[PDB]
Amino acid sequence: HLEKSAVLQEARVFNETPINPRKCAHILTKILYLINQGEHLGTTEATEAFFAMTKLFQSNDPTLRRMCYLTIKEMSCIAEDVIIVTSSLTKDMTGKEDNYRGPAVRALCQITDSTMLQAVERYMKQAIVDKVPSVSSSALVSSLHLLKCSFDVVKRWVNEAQEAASSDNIMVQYHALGLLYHVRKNDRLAVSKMISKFTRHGLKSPFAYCMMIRVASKQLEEEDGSRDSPLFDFIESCLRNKHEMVVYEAASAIVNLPGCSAKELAPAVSVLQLFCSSPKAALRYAAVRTLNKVAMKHPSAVTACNLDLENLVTDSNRSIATLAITTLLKTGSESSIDRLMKQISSFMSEISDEFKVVVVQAISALCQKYPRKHAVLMNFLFTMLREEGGFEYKRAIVDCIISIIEENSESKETGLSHLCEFIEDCEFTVLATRILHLLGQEGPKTNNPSKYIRFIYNRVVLEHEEVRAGAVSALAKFGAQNEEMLPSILVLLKRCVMDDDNEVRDRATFYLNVLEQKQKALNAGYILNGLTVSIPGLEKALQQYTLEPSQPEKVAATRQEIFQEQLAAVPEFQGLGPLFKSSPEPVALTESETEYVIRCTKHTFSDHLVFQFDCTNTLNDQTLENVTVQMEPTEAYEVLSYVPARSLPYNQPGTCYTLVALPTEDPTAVACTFSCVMKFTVKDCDPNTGEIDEEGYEDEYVLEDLEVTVADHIQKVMKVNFEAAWDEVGDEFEKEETFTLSTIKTLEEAVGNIVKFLGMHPCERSDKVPENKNTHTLLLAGVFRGGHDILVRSRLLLLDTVTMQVTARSSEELPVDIILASVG
Amino acid sequence: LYTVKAILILDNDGDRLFAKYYDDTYPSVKEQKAFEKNIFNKTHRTDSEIALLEGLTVVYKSSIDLYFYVIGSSYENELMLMAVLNCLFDSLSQMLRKNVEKRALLENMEGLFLAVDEIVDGGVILESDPQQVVHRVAL
Amino acid sequence: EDIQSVMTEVRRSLGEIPIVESEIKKEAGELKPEEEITVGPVQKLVTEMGTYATQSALSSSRPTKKEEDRPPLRGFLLDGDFFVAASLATTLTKIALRYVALVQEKKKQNSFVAEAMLLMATILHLGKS
Secondary structure, three states, X not given: OXXXXXXXXXXXXXXXXXXXXXXXHHHHHHHHHHHHHOOOOOHHHHHXXXXXXXXXXXXXXXXXXXXXXXXXXXHOXXXXXXXXXXXXXXXXXXXXXHHHHHHHHHHHHHHOOOOOHHHHHXXXXXXXXXXXXXXXXXXXXXXXXXXXXXXXXXXXXXXXXXHHHOOOOHHHHHHHHHHHHHHOOOOHHHHHHHHHHXXXXXXXXXXXXXXXXXXXXXXXXXXXXXXXXXXXXXOOOOOOOOOHHHHHXXXXXXXXXXXXXOEOOEOXXXXXXXXXXXXXXXXXXXXXXXXXXXXXXXXXXXXXHHHHHHHHHHOOOHHHHHHHHHHHHHHOOOOXXXXXXXXXHHHOOOOXXXXXXXXXXXXXXXXXXXXXXXXXXXXXXXXXXXXXXXXXXXXXXXXXXXXXXXXXXXXXXXXXXXXXXXXXOOOOHHHHXXXXXXXXXXXXXXXXXXXXXXXXXXXXXXXXXXXXXXXXXHHHHHHHHOHHHHHHHHHHHHOOOOOOOOHHHHHHHHHHHHHHOOOOHHHHXXXXXXXXXXXXXXXXHHHHHHHOOOOOOOOOOOHHHHHHHHHHHOOHHHHOOOEEEEOOOOEEEEOOOOXXXXXXXXXXXXXXEEEEEEEEEOOOOEEEEEEEEEEEEOOOOEEEEEXXXXXXXXXXXXXXXXXXEOOOOOXXXXXXXXXXXXXXXXXXXXXXXXOOOOOEEEEEEEOOOEEEOHHHHEEEOOOOOHHHHHHHHOOOOOEEEEEEEOXXXXXXXXXXXXXXXXXXXXXXXXXXXXOOOOEEEEEEEEEEHHHEEEEEEEEEEEOOOEEEEEEEEXXXXXXXXXXXXXXX | OOXXXXXXXXXXXXXXXXXXXXXXXXXXXXXXXXXXXXXXXXXXXXXXXXXXXXXXXXXXXXXXXXXXXXXXXXXXXXXXXXHHHHXXXXXXXXXXXXXXXXHHHHHOHHHHHHHHHHHEEXXXXXOOOHHHHHHXXXX | OOHHHHHHHHHOOOOOOOOHHHHHHHHOOOOOOOOOOOOOOHHHHHHHHHXXXXXXXXXXXXXXXXXXXXXXXXXXXXXXXXXXXXXXOOOHHHHHXXXXXXXXXXXXXXXXXXXXXXXXXXXXXXXXX
């Protein structure tokens, strides 16, 4: 239509004296036209045009004002000294009428940056509360843009934003709730308060419902303090308003992840909610679906089926038919697959071009995804090869072949062989590469390789370089794997085809010379089956889904080992007792992502305990350095050393340790409590993940106590015969004490309490005791730190409560004393 | 805050009489036109309120020599999108003082540009009331 | 002696690289064990040659791709090879400085049989009886 240069240029007159609202407005229209028609502005002339226009803001005409808003936003980024236009926009923005109000806030806020943010706020507060949708919605979207430049200004607007939220007017609410969710967010909980306020309400605003559904879709039970249900009384889990999109979004989330469970007037576990909307017009597309559903997509699938299946079969309209395939695909599942496959077979008949490729891929893809047997997948993959013969590709040769060598290989090659009979050189580089690669790699004894070779030999002549090169190298590997083959390799390679073309020659000269001339140490080594060049995943199935309706390694296996590894890096802990075990009951001192996350584990050594404290400073305003967790033992333990966490910045874990020595004569338990306080140096930080200030202050954060149990000292085992082990460990360290467990009225619980506490597995599966028997003998075994066995015998008497005489024997005085004390 | 991906009003080839991009995904002419040609090819010569293109529900209508578009998300349905598309058709008609054809749009290029910006704002649906848009805009 | 410099701009440049792998794999080291140097002698080249084939190594600012061309070819033969580092002996160099089978005339053994345009017409001629 227009020329960008002439129009950008003539705009410069505004900058001088002429303001002429008609002429300038036209010139502006022309700018909008240059963009719209599709053109790109030249920067010098743009920069000039922008400074000129600001003069035009003096004249207040509604059409000129309008031109001015669109033109400055489009020209804003390809212009300089734009800042002048802010004042003019504020002047316009306060002027009453929707033409100015709404369009200005949007143009102003786009140009506005954090410095300028402050200016627009009075006018913004006035514009947001409006139940006149233009002014309010433009102001609400405007605030969203402004969250970037400066967050804090926008946040103050949360009250005006909320005020708009209370409208049932669709725009004012959609914008209000949507924006609010973004704005007020400083934690989940404050947003959740905003949502609960609207939540109990039966809106007539579908957009608000939708934007909110998304916020809601996850279970929120902290909305406005707390509440006893994930409840959403606005359609998400409810079905207060029917309208097929909202109904679909809501129904797929709620069914197997309740936003609330099913109500008689609002299904929300049952499959129903989608289905009542399901017979419909074009509208049906949302309605008919599924996704998730109780307990599977399949009972759901049956409802809707009439609709999806008739459109999919009948309509050879692309627009309908696509909705019908997506809808079939959605009502699908593992079960559904029988049905889904016949339909997809049928579908290509309506739209057959790419759609053909897709159905032959889909039937294979569905068989791989939803199991109807891996074999059937191969058989479908043959049908794909047959029908298209060329829309298979290179990625198919690699994917078919890799997939095939899971089971199919002998068959696949053979099928391929037959498939190769097709068409000599229009079959493509890829099929020849597949029969060639497979015949090379399997080295057929399932069928005679001679047919395969004869088929491939012809294809090579008239097809691309990459296959002819493929054919020589394959032949060489084929030689190395099977001796028999060598005579065919020679007739093929001497030919002008499989060698002596171009690329084919170079590869061949190498491959040939290595087979012919050389040892074939290399050739032998090279064939490991004669496999592909790469093993990807199973690419086809996802591709197909969209297209149709258009080494974790480990050391440790035990808590002691993983901790032992962590400990081992540090010297002191392995140098001063080596680790018998680490706790089977590690206790987290301070909860996750509050102030600190500290998890401590107590590790036992031959004569020591090391406490590993994994410390996180989740303090947004700080970053920590030289952090240690300090300890006060409540019994006689010596605290030898502290190992610091070098730094703990915001949200970054670090580990600190305290090594203490264990008593080895203590008459009371090694079940003991340590009071923990982390001390550290704080340097100020701007929350990101870390950043330290030039100077800072000392600060401390209090932590929970760490409890060490007898369970940490002992590792559980059972014995085949307790009595022998029990005598064998040391009846010379034997001590006996009688306890009453009055809070345990039966033997079975009693055995469980001694077993858990001590960290001893009761022998011979003695946690199950004959219910309410007068006498019982409980056999305990486990190994104590240092590597010495500890056996405990508890002879239980059951009155109405449990009394036990617990006799313990151990290779030391300490386990005996420790167990006896801890139990009572 | 997002519903509408883009709005296009296209001649009966898919070429840009108009498009205004409420996505940031097409700003350059080459690609804005490619998009336009892409959506017009699927959707056209099968009029319904549904089309699925690019994994997005595309809602469209037609006139004498134009096809009118809203592209939006496919987690929705036609009807939500349709409310935008109906506003788009309607508001342009009342605004221009003549029904949407290539002739009405070209007749008043300014009414068309302004009217569409009121309907969609950066992919959020700013307005959907045809009457409101028309008063809001000044020719 | 240029070779690190020439190869390296390409090795870190892009274009289309499937078949590139095969050809570079048998090729890069060859001929004389230490007779180049720009900031990568012939040995860096053998390193490179191996990385490009299917290995991994910092050399020529890394190769463009490593994953080979059509499924049969793979890296391995050549990887084993370069017994004597890029030197005319019984390695890549041997292969490179030798020609696969007979190569003489215009019988189509490293040949193409006259002038390419005249040949299209002769191929067309089926000579059906």
